């Protein structure tokens, strides 16, 4: 469930916030 | 803006 977050990262047009809000907030 | 692939070691690593 990460491949979709890494492939979308190259899509500036595609709004991706689950990479920092979901796969990033984990830091906290 | 990539923090889910640079921090997620155990997750993106084998967690999948």
Swiss-Prot record, chain A:
Expressed predominantly in liver. Also present in plasma. Residues 1-21 are annotated as: Glycosaminoglycan-binding site. The N-terminal acidic repeat region mediates, in part, the glycosaminoglycan-accelerated thrombin inhibition. It comes from the Eukaryota. It comes from Homo sapiens (Human). Belongs to the serpin family. Transmembrane segments: none annotated. It is linked to Thrombophilia due to heparin cofactor 2 deficiency: A hemostatic disorder characterized by a tendency to recurrent thrombosis. The chain holds residues 192 to 219 of 499 of the full protein. The gene is SERPIND1. Thrombin inhibitor activated by the glycosaminoglycans, heparin or dermatan sulfate. In the presence of the latter, HC-II becomes the predominant thrombin inhibitor in place of antithrombin III (AT-III). Also inhibits chymotrypsin, but in a glycosaminoglycan-independent manner. Peptides at the N-terminal of HC-II have chemotactic activity for both monocytes and neutrophils. This is Heparin cofactor 2. Phosphorylated by FAM20C in the extracellular medium.
């Amino acid at each position: 469930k990460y491949e979709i977050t890494t492939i979308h990262n190259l899509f500036r047009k595609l709004t991706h916030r689950l990479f920092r809000r979901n796969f990033g907030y984990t830091l906290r | 803006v990539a923090r889910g692939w640079k921090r997620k070691c155990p997750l993106f690593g084998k967690g999948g």
